[PDB]
Design the sequence.
């Protein structure tokens, strides 16, 4: 499950997710949990239309 | 149909609109060609 | 009762299943401990020792998850089930 979550959210769409995970890897901090993928938010803001 | 309406807790008045919304500008990206022509999604055309 | 393996397959899988209820629980049961170990390493410079460091003495620059798996095989951790 978590692998699929990462592949779909944290390495393809989530901008802040990418920035935060890259910074955490650069440092010794644990990878923060992914966020809301851009695809879902776009789908929302489009279906609300 | 009527029982669905009643249970929804809403009113049928949602079937007559007075204010259509418009999606953000990026969703309908605007494109400039070599001559700057407007050839992006026609969503702009319909809103026009 | 078999030749000692080498690589990431040590300790074996069947031994661990004897402790954990199911293989699906074990992955989280070890990942959380690895997270705690990494947090302890992060605070090693200064802080509170609430996340007690590794129980089994680590090797030479071993990944925290390997430490967690190698200490779980030693039956040194206790956990609660779902909620």
Sequence:
């Amino acid at each position: 499950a978590y692998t699929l979550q990462e592949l779909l959210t944290i390495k393809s769409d989530d901008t802040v997710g990418r920035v935060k995970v890259y910074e955490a890897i650069v440092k010794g901090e644990n990878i923060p949990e992914p966020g809301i993928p851009e695809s879902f938010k776009v789908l929302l803001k489009e279906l609300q239309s | 149909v009527v029982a669905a309406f009643q249970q929804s807790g809403n009113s049928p008045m949602g079937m007559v609109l007075d204010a259509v919304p418009v999606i953000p500008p990026e969703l309908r990206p605007m494109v400039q060609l070599d001559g700057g022509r407007f050839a992006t999604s026609d969503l702009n055309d319909l809103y026009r | 009762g078999y030749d000692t393996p080498l690589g990431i397959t040590n300790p074996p899988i069947d031994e661990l299943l004897d402790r954990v209820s199911s293989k699906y629980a074990l992955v989280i049961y070890a990942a959380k401990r690895a997270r705690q170990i990494n947090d302890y390493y992060n605070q090693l410079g200064e802080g509170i020792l609430e996340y007690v460091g590794p129980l089994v003495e680590p090797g030479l620059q071993e990944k925290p998850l390997s430490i967690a798996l190698r200490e779980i095989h030693a039956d040194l951790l206790e956990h609660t089930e779902g909620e």
